[PDB]
Write a protein that binds this ligand. Structure first.
Ligand SMILES: CC(C)S[C@@H]1O[C@H](CO)[C@H](O)[C@H](O)[C@H]1O
Ligand code: NA
Ligand code: NA
Ligand code: NA
Ligand code: NA
Lengths: 211, 211
């Protein structure tokens, strides 16, 4: 969840918001180790329930998200249903565990490609065109993350947009991402320079991946 | 419906058969002028019911077809339901009136392209990849006719097969068609040559379109 003013500005200027719970357990092995554990249900429930209680009156918020990169656990299903119960007015989405689990109303993959399948075990990233028509699949597809804009990037961006326009149920997505997470440091002359991971003696670090 | 021996041979050699009622009213304006008319229901019904009564015991027959290129009329809906009622063992297909009407268990377009939409009024031929995922659509797609093999043709045949393998619900199609309908004529020297439309004084004719 963002600083409260953000929702007010999105209300007034006019932007659709996905409001997302402060839950990410990416570094767990496997990713759902905590989110499938009932002992972590209370801690997760608070991050979901208190977000809804704070932001449910904002018109800009049109979709609730259960968080990010935490695999798919039973705690997600419980909290998916909690939201659907207290607020039937907004769809719930969650990408973890393969982007099309029982805890999401929207197929919301990250970095799924337009035509090319990437069939990873357990959590394949199908071609988005192909994903829509998988046997039994009826849901809209909106990428929660796509077109990773790291450095000199966004090659093939037009290919997403041609597909979004041709396919009714391909309803777009959210570019990753808006702004570089670089920080300012000063050299010997007091001159500013843009710093990334590792430049603060922080170790281990992931270098320029914050940009 | 074919010569009765055809189905015996397909039973024994192993080919899947689509058995098709002898109903095509292509030249009517509009195409459904007779098939929507209850006065023509009796004549139409006999062509369907008597086909089913003859052929229902052949294992090679896996799909029933209501005919070809006769628009979509209320008589199709009646006869579709008649077949589902008497023979639950076989899906019923029919391409007329847009390839995805209430008279077909299978989206069965003719000459729908792989990636390119052809948005004709009333009866569009959507791209087959796109057709599958249209809002509310769940049926399998099998082209009743594709890859028109007229003369030097089958350009882009690979493109269909790439899509067929990639998309589970694209379950193939039927090439148009097996054999050139040329006829043998004899000149002055008594030497046989291959003849097409018009070569018999027949007029109007559609020339080499029979091949
Ligand atoms: C020429 C099109 C407007 S009709 C087109 O003609 C073809 C010619 O072989 C086949 O008969 C197809 O079934 C038919 O759709
Ligand atoms: Na779209
Ligand atoms: Na990053
Ligand atoms: Na297929
Ligand atoms: Na022909």
């Amino acid at each position: 969840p963002n600083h409260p003013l953000w929702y007010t500005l999105c209300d007034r200027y006019g932007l659709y918001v996905v409001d997302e719970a402060n839950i990410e357990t990416h570094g767990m092995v496997p990713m759902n180790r905590l989110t499938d554990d009932p002992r972590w249900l209370p801690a997760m429930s608070e991050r979901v329930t208190r977000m809804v209680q704070r932001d449910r009156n904002h018109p800009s918020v049109i979709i609730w998200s259960l968080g990010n990169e935490s695999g798919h656990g039973a705690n997600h299903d419980a909290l998916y249903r909690w939201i659907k119960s207290v607020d039937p007015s907004r769809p719930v989405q969650y990408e973890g565990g393969g982007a099309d689990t029982t805890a999401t109303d929207i197929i919301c993959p990250m970095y799924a490609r337009v035509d090319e399948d990437q069939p990873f075990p357990a959590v394949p990233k199908w071609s988005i065109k192909k994903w829509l028509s998988l046997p039994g699949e009826t849901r809209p597809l909106i990428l929660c993350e796509y077109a990773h804009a790291m450095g000199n990037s966004l090659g093939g961006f037009a290919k997403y947009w041609q597909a979004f326009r041709q396919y009714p149920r391909l309803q777009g997505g959210f570019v990753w991402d808006w702004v570089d997470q670089s920080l300012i440091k000063y050299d010997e002359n007091g001159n500013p320079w843009s710093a990334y991971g590792g430049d603060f003696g922080d170790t281990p670090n992931d270098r320029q991946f914050c940009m």
